[PDB]
Amino acid sequence: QLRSWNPPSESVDAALLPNFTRGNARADDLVRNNGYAANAIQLHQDHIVGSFFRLSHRPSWRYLGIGEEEARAFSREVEAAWKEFAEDDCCCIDVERKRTFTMMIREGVAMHAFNGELFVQATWDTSSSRLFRTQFRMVSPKRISNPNNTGDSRNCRAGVQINDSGAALGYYVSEDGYPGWMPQKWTWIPRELPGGRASFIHVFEPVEDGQTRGANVFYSVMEQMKMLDTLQNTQLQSAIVKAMYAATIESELDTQSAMDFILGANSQEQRERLTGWIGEIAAYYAAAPVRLGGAKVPHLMPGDSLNLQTAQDTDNGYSVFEQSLLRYIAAGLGVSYEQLSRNYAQMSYSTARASANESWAYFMGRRKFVASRQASQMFLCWLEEAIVRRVVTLPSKARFSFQEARSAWGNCDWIGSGRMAIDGLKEVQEAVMLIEAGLSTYEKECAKRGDDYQEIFAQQVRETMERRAAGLKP
Template structure:
């Protein structure tokens, strides 16, 4: 039955958007989705969606490759701290801020990137970079990443702050109670939908049992922060809508395609194997009914007759060993013919279909098709660079919103302890203490993996031109390469001094610079004369 909306005059109300009507030829008539909030759409099926995403990452090559792309491009091999205290707000000099930044960066790297003791990890399994890589991988899989702050005294560790990684699988409502206004998805909230505490389960399950199927365990309530503002639980995700409590994993929009492309590949592989197994078949002129009557007959002796018939024909084929010049010539049973089978290797559009599906999946994952499929055979430099730049923009957003935000929260916890216990001291003359201007004291940036260079020479020339024209700085360009400009400059100074002491000539770029300066000096002197 057609339903019409009438205006005040009883006339059908016209719609400004065709997408909200039944469409051309009533094609949209049966498409009537329900308008829901983010939590109403996500939370009832959160466990199943995350379980399917987890299964895809474990068993699907493209899904696992997508996670690895996120980790390698967002974080890389070292996640560097670039500490930048807001010295104007704090009332300290820029020189003092730079000196303090050097001390803070050195102390943080020494503790957080300790590859032997791993004191910054509560489990003592990961360095700080490894923890950030896990955060990005978890977020790419489940749409969110979680961790808790711990205070652990350990022999040999200068600091007591440690970070405990928390799997989103473990955050749920205590005793699996239904979601309510102030408790949704294991997150306790206030009237403004601001998180107050998180409920983490330590399930009592045996080997091989599933966390999501258990109703019993020990839930621990972890407050978001202490009364004085020290953060106790870190929840990193990017909300798409107001009031959203939990993150939605990226696989939800392409999960069906990822699941089916695996089945498509396996079916094609099985088909190819079966076609290659049989080189020839022996066909009989007898139709099915006649052959059945001849072989089986009727009565209780039918099974014995079938066995005798197969044994007889098998013995006949084995005994018909006729050869000519070493080549075997089959002598078939009367009424049989030999039909050679050529293994079919026809693509039947499989490659095009798979490529189209992978492009769809790549768009849903925020990466390029070439990166996801590892296929660069059909692109030139311009198209490959455009594709990489689109992906790089996406990865930089993920670095800023997820990786850097999580890392900044962990760094703030560490810096609070370092200042409170006088391991590090604030510059003299600061107008505010740590708690009065926490954001200014903890302001920092993070340097991850560098951008992939398709043509290194062209991209270096581009960076040089941007610097020379005043459109960029060494700090920005080296950050794009995944390097810290201060470390590079200091290393260049050390290397230059060492080359002088060893009697080696300076690098060619320094010679060119010196030659240009001499030429300019001579020209200026000549003009003056």
């Protein structure tokens, strides 16, 4: 059996680049048409990032030798600039001016999930109408290709130029080709600016050394979606044919040897027999109208009888079939089966919680490794621009300048939508015991609930002093 299957060994790029375009096209097709694909990418959307994506700046004051309170004041100021820069109504952060930062992260993560990678370009606007001239534009991966669709080489594969070590030196971005009446042109974009500023950002997850383009997850399930739909159509046709109404009027006649003799006679000169019998039958059944259903039952030839036998006549087993399928696609896509297919039948509380736990662990992994990095990239660019314009002020006793210690100044962590309770009470008690018994601290409790404890404390103070100012019990 196994002797009939000898797949060759090639590097990941060797096994991916030749069919990269068709794979991306098929992934887009499933995303656009298939319902489950849209559902799954949608769960990825509202769970990796969720409703909002809040920043929290955590400068490494110890490394920079900066007073901790000074670092806290600096972080407060940079956050003050940042949120008002991010959620601007004008969408000025986007050069295209239709998306804000939250759906920036959303589009990025969904784009990576369904294509394997994401590309962001940071541009320096010239308009002075805004304090910040740094804007961002997403580049769809299909716009990244070799110029003139030339064959790839050692240092030029799939539109990205590499060095000896495989590091990306730059990219070839193709302009829009819509409508198909103009020839696409490719522009060379260096990966980063000479000053170290990240002009272009490419974020994806590699599985081995030398991989240059990410692989969408759908590569493992496309076939399964196909047997799924084909199962749908064939089961529909089974239902259709299961209600077939076969009914006919027939006459036995056809007198065997005399049937052959009558056939010979009719062929010779005796078609009159057949014609007269047909006429008599027509007259009789036009006097009759035997209408079994809504129509006249057809009349058949002498010796001709309708025969429609079928295949196996048992239960098809559709239920367990598509159960196994949906389970397969759910496993391939890394999300729990029940939430993918919203089939919560006979499900226990503990078991549902465990499944949600597994999916949540996967989801935090992806959020940490995909959304966080890209968000940190834009944050670094914007903070560099802000310090350039002195919107914020560095500490006077800074051990290093911003350029030397970009990571140190820019050390930031992002909080998305928290884990939302299955039941509420049990996890609330969890937080209460954790915070009271010393195994936990308020910041992470607000983190898994999608909050920050600073403004929480400030608002609690305000609530208390208002309540006591109004005579209410604090």
